[PDB]
Amino acid sequence: HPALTPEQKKELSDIAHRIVAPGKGILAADESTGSIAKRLQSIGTENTEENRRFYRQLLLTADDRVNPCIGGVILFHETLYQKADDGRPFPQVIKSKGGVVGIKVDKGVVPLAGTNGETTTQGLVGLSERCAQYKKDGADFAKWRCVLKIGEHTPSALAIMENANVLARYASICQQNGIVPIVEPEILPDGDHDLKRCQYVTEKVLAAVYKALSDHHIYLEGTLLKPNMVTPGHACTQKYSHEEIAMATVTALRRTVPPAVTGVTFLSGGQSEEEASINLNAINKCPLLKPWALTFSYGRALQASALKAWGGKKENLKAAQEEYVKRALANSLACQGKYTS
């Protein structure tokens, strides 16, 4: 569509920069019902709209200690339209604490015909209308997740090309509607591959992603990247230090992400809460030159303990918030390379 005006670019750049301002990261609370369903059953809690509303309220209304730690919060569409007990729409709750409101806009992963168990992501249909609507309703940034898997002959060239193209189309539509797109090309940790294999694949995928964004004239200063850290496979037989993980990650990014990108907000994948903080901290202590903010966009890494403490019981509200606050503070320090465990 038509090229962006100076005003449109300024809006996008300002939004992107506020989300990843020094010491800040993103709370990824955008689990769909199917996704949140599994989280709730793990704590023997009924997956109902009210319990989902209460849980999101619990996270969003944590005390002001999280304000300097949380630059943005990603929501699922249901939550974008829910209200706290005091009548305030959740987007208002988020903004009153200094956070930018985000909205997941993809509609899940689906099989990519002809491939060996590979996938693509659906949701481009009606995306422009949804973005305009979400913008009107309080959201300033969005998120779209694509998944790639490392295997004998995967990810294939077809899968990489397909997913990078979709991310670029999504990003263009977002910017046309004044929304900062967070591009998430997640490479699963599944498999027995080693660290260098993950690094190689990550470099291949990100290169495809940015060429695709270029092809679609995406304003990079008005975007964020949410990639996987470079780690050994979940079934890898070799052990790696946090330093090796940090070096592999920063190197992969330096070899592929243009300096114009405003920030990188890592997903935690299957890492434990502390592991995710330690690795992010190590990434920020790496002496190499890094031209973009290196921070967090964590779901489980910020919520695991809180969800467990809550247990679906209202009396556990404050205890649950405390677990979340502790992780928010930890990661706020980690994205500054100042976290000490």
Q: Is 116 left (phi over 0), alpha (psi -120 to 50) or beta?
A: beta
Three-state secondary-structure class, residue 152? coil
Count of CB atoms situated within 10 Å of the CB of 275: 17
Least distance to a second copy, CB of residue 327, Å: 30
272 marked ligand binding residue: no
Nearest approach in angstroms of CB 259 to a second copy is 4
Residue whose CB is less far from a second copy, 20 or 302:
20
CB of 316 to a second copy, least distance (A): 45
Dist. CA 71–CA 24, nearest whole Å: 5
* CB closer to a second copy, 96 vs 214: 214
8-state DSSP, 4: P
Distance set, CA 173 to CA 124, 170, 178, 213 (Å) = 9, 5, 9, 12
Amino acid at 98: G
Q: Is 53 annotated as a binding residue?
A: no
The SS3 of residue 141 is strand
Indicate the DSSP class of residue 83: B
Which of the residues are catalytic?
Answer: 184, 226
Residue 232: is the preceding peptide bond cis (ω within 30°)?
no
Residue 172 is labelled as binding a ligand: no
166 or 293: whose CB is closer to a second copy? Answer: 293
Which CB atom, from 202 or from 231, has the smaller least distance to a second copy? 202
Q: Which residues bind a second copy (CB under 8 A)?
A: 203-204, 207-208, 210-211, 214-215, 220, 251, 253-260, 289-291
To a second copy, the closest distance from the beta carbon of 13 in angstroms equals 12
Question: Nearest CA to 144 among 28, 49, 57, 249?
Answer: 28
Measured between alpha carbons, how far is residue 306 from residues 26, 45, 223, 316, 339 in Å? 16, 14, 30, 10, 20
DSSP letter at 288 equals: S
Known binding residue 270? Answer is yes
For a second copy, give the closer residue by CB, 9 or 242: 9
Terminal Cα-to-Cα distance of the chain (whole angstroms) = 48
Check the annotation: does 39 bind a ligand: yes
- For the chain, how big is the Rg over CA atoms in Å? 19
Least Cβ distance, residue 264 to a second copy (angstroms): 12
Residue 269 assigned ligand-binding role: yes
Closest Cα partner for 80 from 39, 16, 138?
138
Q: Which residues does the annotation place in the binding site for beta-D-fructose 1,6-bisphosphate? A: 39, 268-270, 297, 300
